[PDB]
Every structure is written in C-alpha cells, then in structure tokens.
mmCIF file with all atom_site columns, C-alpha atoms in Angstrom:
data_model
loop_
_atom_site.group_PDB
_atom_site.id
_atom_site.type_symbol
_atom_site.label_atom_id
_atom_site.label_alt_id
_atom_site.label_comp_id
_atom_site.label_asym_id
_atom_site.label_entity_id
_atom_site.label_seq_id
_atom_site.pdbx_PDB_ins_code
_atom_site.Cartn_x
_atom_site.Cartn_y
_atom_site.Cartn_z
_atom_site.occupancy
_atom_site.B_iso_or_equiv
_atom_site.pdbx_formal_charge
_atom_site.auth_seq_id
_atom_site.auth_comp_id
_atom_site.auth_asym_id
_atom_site.auth_atom_id
_atom_site.pdbx_PDB_model_num
ATOM 1   C CA . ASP A 1 1   ? 23.464  -13.796 -6.221  1.00 28.09 ? 29  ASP A CA 1
ATOM 2   C CA . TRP A 1 2   ? 20.081  -12.185 -5.583  1.00 26.33 ? 30  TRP A CA 1
ATOM 3   C CA . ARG A 1 3   ? 21.687  -8.815  -4.879  1.00 26.64 ? 31  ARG A CA 1
ATOM 4   C CA . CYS A 1 4   ? 23.120  -8.658  -8.417  1.00 26.57 ? 32  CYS A CA 1
ATOM 5   C CA . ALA A 1 5   ? 19.839  -9.341  -10.195 1.00 24.67 ? 33  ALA A CA 1
ATOM 6   C CA . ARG A 1 6   ? 18.718  -6.593  -12.557 1.00 22.70 ? 34  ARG A CA 1
ATOM 7   C CA . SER A 1 7   ? 15.021  -7.465  -12.768 1.00 26.52 ? 35  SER A CA 1
ATOM 8   C CA . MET A 1 8   ? 12.147  -9.206  -11.044 1.00 25.39 ? 36  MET A CA 1
ATOM 9   C CA . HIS A 1 9   ? 12.141  -11.439 -14.143 1.00 26.03 ? 37  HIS A CA 1
ATOM 10  C CA . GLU A 1 10  ? 15.266  -13.236 -12.920 1.00 27.78 ? 38  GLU A CA 1
ATOM 11  C CA . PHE A 1 11  ? 13.376  -14.746 -9.964  1.00 29.75 ? 39  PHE A CA 1
ATOM 12  C CA . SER A 1 12  ? 11.009  -17.666 -9.468  1.00 27.84 ? 40  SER A CA 1
ATOM 13  C CA . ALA A 1 13  ? 8.461   -18.414 -6.769  1.00 29.37 ? 41  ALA A CA 1
ATOM 14  C CA . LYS A 1 14  ? 5.997   -21.136 -5.821  1.00 29.10 ? 42  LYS A CA 1
ATOM 15  C CA . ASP A 1 15  ? 2.378   -20.279 -6.571  1.00 29.97 ? 43  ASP A CA 1
ATOM 16  C CA . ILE A 1 16  ? -0.258  -20.930 -3.928  1.00 27.90 ? 44  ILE A CA 1
ATOM 17  C CA . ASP A 1 17  ? -0.933  -24.395 -5.418  1.00 25.83 ? 45  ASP A CA 1
ATOM 18  C CA . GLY A 1 18  ? 2.720   -25.361 -4.927  1.00 26.22 ? 46  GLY A CA 1
ATOM 19  C CA . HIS A 1 19  ? 3.829   -25.066 -8.562  1.00 28.58 ? 47  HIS A CA 1
ATOM 20  C CA . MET A 1 20  ? 6.942   -23.112 -9.476  1.00 28.56 ? 48  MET A CA 1
ATOM 21  C CA . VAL A 1 21  ? 6.361   -19.891 -11.445 1.00 29.09 ? 49  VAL A CA 1
ATOM 22  C CA . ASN A 1 22  ? 9.090   -18.227 -13.505 1.00 27.17 ? 50  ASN A CA 1
ATOM 23  C CA . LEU A 1 23  ? 8.556   -14.518 -12.943 1.00 24.82 ? 51  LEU A CA 1
ATOM 24  C CA . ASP A 1 24  ? 9.941   -13.781 -16.417 1.00 25.66 ? 52  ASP A CA 1
ATOM 25  C CA . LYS A 1 25  ? 6.332   -14.429 -17.493 1.00 21.27 ? 53  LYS A CA 1
ATOM 26  C CA . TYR A 1 26  ? 5.620   -10.871 -16.315 1.00 21.77 ? 54  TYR A CA 1
ATOM 27  C CA . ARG A 1 27  ? 7.980   -9.285  -18.851 1.00 19.10 ? 55  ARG A CA 1
ATOM 28  C CA . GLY A 1 28  ? 6.028   -6.612  -20.688 1.00 17.68 ? 56  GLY A CA 1
ATOM 29  C CA . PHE A 1 29  ? 3.515   -6.147  -17.859 1.00 16.83 ? 57  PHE A CA 1
ATOM 30  C CA . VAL A 1 30  ? 3.266   -3.569  -15.088 1.00 13.52 ? 58  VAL A CA 1
ATOM 31  C CA . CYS A 1 31  ? 3.028   -5.380  -11.757 1.00 14.21 ? 59  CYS A CA 1
ATOM 32  C CA . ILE A 1 32  ? 2.048   -4.666  -8.184  1.00 14.03 ? 60  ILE A CA 1
ATOM 33  C CA . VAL A 1 33  ? 3.879   -7.012  -5.781  1.00 14.01 ? 61  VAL A CA 1
ATOM 34  C CA . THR A 1 34  ? 2.408   -7.068  -2.281  1.00 17.27 ? 62  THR A CA 1
ATOM 35  C CA . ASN A 1 35  ? 2.615   -9.080  0.940   1.00 16.35 ? 63  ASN A CA 1
ATOM 36  C CA . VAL A 1 36  ? -0.862  -10.063 2.096   1.00 16.51 ? 64  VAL A CA 1
ATOM 37  C CA . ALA A 1 37  ? -2.577  -11.282 5.265   1.00 15.11 ? 65  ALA A CA 1
ATOM 38  C CA . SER A 1 38  ? -6.090  -12.480 6.073   1.00 12.68 ? 66  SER A CA 1
ATOM 39  C CA . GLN A 1 39  ? -6.495  -11.224 9.665   1.00 9.69  ? 67  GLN A CA 1
ATOM 40  C CA . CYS A 1 40  ? -5.295  -7.623  9.286   1.00 6.40  ? 68  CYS A CA 1
ATOM 41  C CA . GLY A 1 41  ? -7.309  -4.456  9.861   1.00 12.27 ? 69  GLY A CA 1
ATOM 42  C CA . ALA A 1 42  ? -6.483  -3.515  6.258   1.00 11.09 ? 70  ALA A CA 1
ATOM 43  C CA . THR A 1 43  ? -7.279  -6.917  4.704   1.00 14.72 ? 71  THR A CA 1
ATOM 44  C CA . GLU A 1 44  ? -10.692 -5.912  3.345   1.00 12.08 ? 72  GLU A CA 1
ATOM 45  C CA . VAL A 1 45  ? -9.659  -2.621  1.756   1.00 13.97 ? 73  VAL A CA 1
ATOM 46  C CA . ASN A 1 46  ? -6.516  -4.089  0.191   1.00 10.80 ? 74  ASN A CA 1
ATOM 47  C CA . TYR A 1 47  ? -8.156  -7.166  -1.323  1.00 14.58 ? 75  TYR A CA 1
ATOM 48  C CA . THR A 1 48  ? -11.173 -5.155  -2.509  1.00 13.06 ? 76  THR A CA 1
ATOM 49  C CA . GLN A 1 49  ? -9.076  -2.477  -4.189  1.00 13.63 ? 77  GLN A CA 1
ATOM 50  C CA . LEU A 1 50  ? -6.466  -4.849  -5.654  1.00 13.95 ? 78  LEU A CA 1
ATOM 51  C CA . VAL A 1 51  ? -9.315  -6.811  -7.268  1.00 10.37 ? 79  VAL A CA 1
ATOM 52  C CA . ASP A 1 52  ? -10.793 -3.518  -8.507  1.00 9.09  ? 80  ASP A CA 1
ATOM 53  C CA . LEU A 1 53  ? -7.508  -2.318  -10.040 1.00 10.09 ? 81  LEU A CA 1
ATOM 54  C CA . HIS A 1 54  ? -6.903  -5.691  -11.679 1.00 9.54  ? 82  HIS A CA 1
ATOM 55  C CA . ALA A 1 55  ? -10.391 -5.668  -13.197 1.00 8.32  ? 83  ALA A CA 1
ATOM 56  C CA . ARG A 1 56  ? -10.148 -2.129  -14.552 1.00 7.35  ? 84  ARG A CA 1
ATOM 57  C CA . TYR A 1 57  ? -6.539  -2.284  -15.827 1.00 7.84  ? 85  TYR A CA 1
ATOM 58  C CA . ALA A 1 58  ? -5.813  -5.854  -16.966 1.00 9.71  ? 86  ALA A CA 1
ATOM 59  C CA . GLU A 1 59  ? -6.437  -4.656  -20.555 1.00 9.44  ? 87  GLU A CA 1
ATOM 60  C CA . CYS A 1 60  ? -3.492  -2.267  -19.995 1.00 10.44 ? 88  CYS A CA 1
ATOM 61  C CA . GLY A 1 61  ? -1.270  -5.054  -18.724 1.00 13.06 ? 89  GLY A CA 1
ATOM 62  C CA . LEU A 1 62  ? -1.651  -4.717  -14.965 1.00 12.38 ? 90  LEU A CA 1
ATOM 63  C CA . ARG A 1 63  ? -0.727  -7.859  -13.051 1.00 15.07 ? 91  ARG A CA 1
ATOM 64  C CA . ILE A 1 64  ? -0.727  -8.383  -9.280  1.00 15.35 ? 92  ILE A CA 1
ATOM 65  C CA . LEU A 1 65  ? 1.505   -10.813 -7.362  1.00 15.60 ? 93  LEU A CA 1
ATOM 66  C CA . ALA A 1 66  ? 0.262   -11.496 -3.841  1.00 13.43 ? 94  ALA A CA 1
ATOM 67  C CA . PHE A 1 67  ? 2.622   -13.155 -1.344  1.00 12.44 ? 95  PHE A CA 1
ATOM 68  C CA . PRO A 1 68  ? 1.004   -14.278 1.924   1.00 12.83 ? 96  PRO A CA 1
ATOM 69  C CA . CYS A 1 69  ? 3.182   -13.613 4.950   1.00 14.96 ? 97  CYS A CA 1
ATOM 70  C CA . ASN A 1 70  ? 2.672   -14.397 8.648   1.00 14.10 ? 98  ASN A CA 1
ATOM 71  C CA . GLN A 1 71  ? 5.461   -12.166 10.021  1.00 13.66 ? 99  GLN A CA 1
ATOM 72  C CA . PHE A 1 72  ? 3.265   -9.214  11.085  1.00 9.64  ? 100 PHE A CA 1
ATOM 73  C CA . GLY A 1 73  ? 1.189   -9.965  14.159  1.00 6.57  ? 101 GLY A CA 1
ATOM 74  C CA . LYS A 1 74  ? 0.787   -13.565 12.951  1.00 8.02  ? 102 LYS A CA 1
ATOM 75  C CA . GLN A 1 75  ? -2.046  -12.284 10.783  1.00 6.02  ? 103 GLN A CA 1
ATOM 76  C CA . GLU A 1 76  ? -1.683  -14.965 8.075   1.00 6.41  ? 104 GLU A CA 1
ATOM 77  C CA . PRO A 1 77  ? -1.726  -18.173 10.142  1.00 9.51  ? 105 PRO A CA 1
ATOM 78  C CA . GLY A 1 78  ? -3.637  -20.384 7.712   1.00 8.39  ? 106 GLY A CA 1
ATOM 79  C CA . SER A 1 79  ? -2.475  -22.966 5.227   1.00 11.03 ? 107 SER A CA 1
ATOM 80  C CA . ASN A 1 80  ? -1.859  -22.073 1.603   1.00 15.18 ? 108 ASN A CA 1
ATOM 81  C CA . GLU A 1 81  ? -5.110  -23.869 0.765   1.00 16.81 ? 109 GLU A CA 1
ATOM 82  C CA . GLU A 1 82  ? -7.029  -21.811 3.329   1.00 18.18 ? 110 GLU A CA 1
ATOM 83  C CA . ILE A 1 83  ? -5.465  -18.591 2.030   1.00 21.02 ? 111 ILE A CA 1
ATOM 84  C CA . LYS A 1 84  ? -6.427  -19.485 -1.556  1.00 23.20 ? 112 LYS A CA 1
ATOM 85  C CA . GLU A 1 85  ? -10.029 -20.032 -0.464  1.00 23.99 ? 113 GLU A CA 1
ATOM 86  C CA . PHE A 1 86  ? -9.956  -16.738 1.444   1.00 25.21 ? 114 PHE A CA 1
ATOM 87  C CA . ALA A 1 87  ? -8.824  -14.890 -1.693  1.00 22.95 ? 115 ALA A CA 1
ATOM 88  C CA . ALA A 1 88  ? -11.549 -16.666 -3.662  1.00 26.70 ? 116 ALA A CA 1
ATOM 89  C CA . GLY A 1 89  ? -14.069 -14.979 -1.353  1.00 24.58 ? 117 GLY A CA 1
ATOM 90  C CA . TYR A 1 90  ? -12.876 -11.619 -2.713  1.00 26.67 ? 118 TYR A CA 1
ATOM 91  C CA . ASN A 1 91  ? -13.125 -12.882 -6.329  1.00 27.17 ? 119 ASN A CA 1
ATOM 92  C CA . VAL A 1 92  ? -9.357  -12.600 -6.757  1.00 29.23 ? 120 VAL A CA 1
ATOM 93  C CA . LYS A 1 93  ? -8.287  -13.280 -10.333 1.00 26.07 ? 121 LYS A CA 1
ATOM 94  C CA . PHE A 1 94  ? -4.667  -12.107 -9.967  1.00 23.70 ? 122 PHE A CA 1
ATOM 95  C CA . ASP A 1 95  ? -1.770  -14.349 -8.977  1.00 23.30 ? 123 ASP A CA 1
ATOM 96  C CA . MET A 1 96  ? -1.579  -15.846 -5.465  1.00 25.50 ? 124 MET A CA 1
ATOM 97  C CA . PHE A 1 97  ? 1.733   -17.278 -4.246  1.00 26.96 ? 125 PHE A CA 1
ATOM 98  C CA . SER A 1 98  ? 2.655   -19.668 -1.449  1.00 26.42 ? 126 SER A CA 1
ATOM 99  C CA . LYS A 1 99  ? 3.286   -18.172 1.985   1.00 26.38 ? 127 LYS A CA 1
ATOM 100 C CA . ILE A 1 100 ? 6.801   -16.753 2.441   1.00 25.00 ? 128 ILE A CA 1
ATOM 101 C CA . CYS A 1 101 ? 8.884   -14.622 4.758   1.00 22.17 ? 129 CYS A CA 1
ATOM 102 C CA . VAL A 1 102 ? 9.631   -11.106 3.530   1.00 24.91 ? 130 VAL A CA 1
ATOM 103 C CA . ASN A 1 103 ? 12.081  -10.087 6.298   1.00 25.91 ? 131 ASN A CA 1
ATOM 104 C CA . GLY A 1 104 ? 15.024  -11.873 7.847   1.00 25.78 ? 132 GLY A CA 1
ATOM 105 C CA . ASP A 1 105 ? 17.568  -14.370 6.624   1.00 26.15 ? 133 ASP A CA 1
ATOM 106 C CA . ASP A 1 106 ? 14.888  -16.733 5.269   1.00 23.47 ? 134 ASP A CA 1
ATOM 107 C CA . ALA A 1 107 ? 13.065  -14.068 3.243   1.00 24.81 ? 135 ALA A CA 1
ATOM 108 C CA . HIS A 1 108 ? 12.260  -15.016 -0.320  1.00 25.45 ? 136 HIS A CA 1
ATOM 109 C CA . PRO A 1 109 ? 15.084  -13.701 -2.537  1.00 25.81 ? 137 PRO A CA 1
ATOM 110 C CA . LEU A 1 110 ? 12.698  -11.583 -4.635  1.00 25.10 ? 138 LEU A CA 1
ATOM 111 C CA . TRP A 1 111 ? 11.787  -9.670  -1.485  1.00 25.83 ? 139 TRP A CA 1
ATOM 112 C CA . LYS A 1 112 ? 15.426  -9.369  -0.405  1.00 25.45 ? 140 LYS A CA 1
ATOM 113 C CA . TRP A 1 113 ? 16.111  -7.864  -3.819  1.00 27.46 ? 141 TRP A CA 1
ATOM 114 C CA . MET A 1 114 ? 13.140  -5.490  -3.958  1.00 28.56 ? 142 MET A CA 1
ATOM 115 C CA . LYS A 1 115 ? 14.026  -3.958  -0.594  1.00 27.25 ? 143 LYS A CA 1
ATOM 116 C CA . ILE A 1 116 ? 17.456  -2.797  -1.786  1.00 28.09 ? 144 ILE A CA 1
ATOM 117 C CA . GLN A 1 117 ? 16.405  -1.449  -5.179  1.00 27.67 ? 145 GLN A CA 1
ATOM 118 C CA . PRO A 1 118 ? 16.964  2.330   -5.485  1.00 25.51 ? 146 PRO A CA 1
ATOM 119 C CA . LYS A 1 119 ? 13.212  2.981   -5.701  1.00 23.35 ? 147 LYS A CA 1
ATOM 120 C CA . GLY A 1 120 ? 12.331  0.266   -3.169  1.00 24.21 ? 148 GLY A CA 1
ATOM 121 C CA . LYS A 1 121 ? 13.914  2.134   -0.253  1.00 25.21 ? 149 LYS A CA 1
ATOM 122 C CA . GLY A 1 122 ? 11.990  2.131   3.008   1.00 25.41 ? 150 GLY A CA 1
ATOM 123 C CA . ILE A 1 123 ? 11.729  4.677   5.803   1.00 27.21 ? 151 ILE A CA 1
ATOM 124 C CA . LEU A 1 124 ? 14.299  4.209   8.587   1.00 24.73 ? 152 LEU A CA 1
ATOM 125 C CA . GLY A 1 125 ? 15.532  0.999   7.015   1.00 28.03 ? 153 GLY A CA 1
ATOM 126 C CA . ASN A 1 126 ? 14.340  -1.137  4.143   1.00 29.00 ? 154 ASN A CA 1
ATOM 127 C CA . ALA A 1 127 ? 12.577  -3.887  6.117   1.00 27.25 ? 155 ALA A CA 1
ATOM 128 C CA . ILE A 1 128 ? 8.934   -4.506  5.297   1.00 29.11 ? 156 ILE A CA 1
ATOM 129 C CA . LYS A 1 129 ? 7.078   -2.720  8.079   1.00 31.30 ? 157 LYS A CA 1
ATOM 130 C CA . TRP A 1 130 ? 3.684   -4.473  8.047   1.00 32.99 ? 158 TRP A CA 1
ATOM 131 C CA . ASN A 1 131 ? 1.130   -6.357  5.977   1.00 32.86 ? 159 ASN A CA 1
ATOM 132 C CA . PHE A 1 132 ? 0.231   -4.957  2.552   1.00 34.14 ? 160 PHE A CA 1
ATOM 133 C CA . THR A 1 133 ? 3.378   -3.159  1.589   1.00 31.94 ? 161 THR A CA 1
ATOM 134 C CA . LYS A 1 134 ? 3.346   -2.655  -2.199  1.00 32.81 ? 162 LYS A CA 1
ATOM 135 C CA . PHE A 1 135 ? 6.060   -2.473  -4.842  1.00 31.21 ? 163 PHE A CA 1
ATOM 136 C CA . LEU A 1 136 ? 5.294   -1.170  -8.320  1.00 33.90 ? 164 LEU A CA 1
ATOM 137 C CA . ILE A 1 137 ? 7.284   -3.025  -10.987 1.00 33.16 ? 165 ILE A CA 1
ATOM 138 C CA . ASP A 1 138 ? 7.696   -1.698  -14.525 1.00 30.35 ? 166 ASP A CA 1
ATOM 139 C CA . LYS A 1 139 ? 7.526   -3.716  -17.742 1.00 30.54 ? 167 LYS A CA 1
ATOM 140 C CA . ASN A 1 140 ? 11.271  -4.432  -17.551 1.00 31.17 ? 168 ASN A CA 1
ATOM 141 C CA . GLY A 1 141 ? 10.919  -5.888  -14.053 1.00 31.37 ? 169 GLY A CA 1
ATOM 142 C CA . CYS A 1 142 ? 12.460  -2.912  -12.234 1.00 33.65 ? 170 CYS A CA 1
ATOM 143 C CA . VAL A 1 143 ? 11.165  -1.532  -8.950  1.00 33.71 ? 171 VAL A CA 1
ATOM 144 C CA . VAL A 1 144 ? 9.805   1.951   -9.607  1.00 33.62 ? 172 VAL A CA 1
ATOM 145 C CA . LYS A 1 145 ? 7.951   2.779   -6.362  1.00 34.14 ? 173 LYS A CA 1
ATOM 146 C CA . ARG A 1 146 ? 7.220   1.479   -2.884  1.00 34.92 ? 174 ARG A CA 1
ATOM 147 C CA . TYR A 1 147 ? 3.955   2.083   -1.013  1.00 34.64 ? 175 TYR A CA 1
ATOM 148 C CA . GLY A 1 148 ? 3.501   1.657   2.737   1.00 34.61 ? 176 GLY A CA 1
ATOM 149 C CA . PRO A 1 149 ? 1.091   -0.606  4.616   1.00 34.19 ? 177 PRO A CA 1
ATOM 150 C CA . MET A 1 150 ? -1.372  2.280   5.158   1.00 35.26 ? 178 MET A CA 1
ATOM 151 C CA . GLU A 1 151 ? -1.428  3.405   1.511   1.00 36.51 ? 179 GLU A CA 1
ATOM 152 C CA . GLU A 1 152 ? -4.544  1.798   0.068   1.00 37.48 ? 180 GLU A CA 1
ATOM 153 C CA . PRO A 1 153 ? -4.108  0.248   -3.395  1.00 36.13 ? 181 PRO A CA 1
ATOM 154 C CA . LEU A 1 154 ? -6.120  2.978   -5.128  1.00 35.75 ? 182 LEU A CA 1
ATOM 155 C CA . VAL A 1 155 ? -3.277  5.401   -4.294  1.00 37.85 ? 183 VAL A CA 1
ATOM 156 C CA . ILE A 1 156 ? -1.209  3.502   -6.891  1.00 36.84 ? 184 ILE A CA 1
ATOM 157 C CA . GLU A 1 157 ? -3.635  4.246   -9.707  1.00 40.63 ? 185 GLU A CA 1
ATOM 158 C CA . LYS A 1 158 ? -2.319  7.733   -10.468 1.00 40.71 ? 186 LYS A CA 1
ATOM 159 C CA . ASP A 1 159 ? 1.184   6.311   -10.993 1.00 42.16 ? 187 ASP A CA 1
ATOM 160 C CA . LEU A 1 160 ? 0.207   3.521   -13.415 1.00 41.89 ? 188 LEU A CA 1
ATOM 161 C CA . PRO A 1 161 ? 0.085   5.753   -16.565 1.00 43.84 ? 189 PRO A CA 1
ATOM 162 C CA . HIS A 1 162 ? 3.798   6.438   -16.161 1.00 42.24 ? 190 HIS A CA 1
ATOM 163 C CA . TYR A 1 163 ? 4.571   2.741   -16.781 1.00 41.35 ? 191 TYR A CA 1
ATOM 164 C CA . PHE A 1 164 ? 1.873   1.282   -19.068 1.00 43.69 ? 192 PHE A CA 1
#
C-alpha cells in the first residue's frame, strides 16, 4: 500500500531509458524530486538552476530526480528519448525518469505518497499545481519540504544545510 510507505526508498521507478530504478539507492543522500516539462515558461530557469545546484552540491550528497509529466498544459509532449536529448542540451547529469502522471488515479505511487506526507502538503489541496513542483527529501527518504511551481530551484539552497 503506497499510503503506508515510510520512505521514498520503498519505491521504484523507470528511468528515462526504460530501466527500473530502486529508489533505495538514494538512501544517505538529500534529494530534490521534481516534475519537469520542456515547453514551459519556467523550463529554462528550472533546468539551469537544477544543473547548477547538482554541480555545486553533489560532493555534499545532493541528488535530483526529474520526472517528466505532460499533465500541465501538455507542455511535455515528446517521447522519453526526445526528453532525454532535451535534458542533454542543459548538460543534465542528475537522474532523468520516464514520463509519468503526477495527479489522478494513474499517478506514479511515489507522487501519490509524497503529496500526502505531512511536509508535502499543498495549498488548497495536495494536487500538483503545475510543472516544476519540488519536494525536498532527506537522507532517510522522508519529505521535508514542498516548493511551488514558481519557486526557482535556487530558493531550495538555503534549506539544504538542514539535511546534509
């Protein structure tokens, strides 16, 4: 039962190449989990700053899990292969996953779970509101903060020292 999970580490997800990833591999690492899109007004700032954070903090254990999602204005219409090439244009070295839903009955169970964590609460409901929502995950796999679609990734930086 996804609702009874205690940690992100209990979940698995397909990477953007189609291979299953056990998210227990992130135990001991602080993670940003985010839903991404290629044709969003915020695409450039989010990819640029996620790549920047990953570069400057990997030595501290920062990992980033990017889930493409086409549910918000159909702004991620491409294939997984096309999305991987798009991320390559931003020199992404963090982890890209296969396209998923984040809302609704067919949402990936990790996203169902994050949305009902105590610190994953949304505003006027827990649904993901738009592209580039972010969840901060601590080293034990627990949700510790949620950031809205308009909060650029650099806003997360001041919170990282509380979890490294």
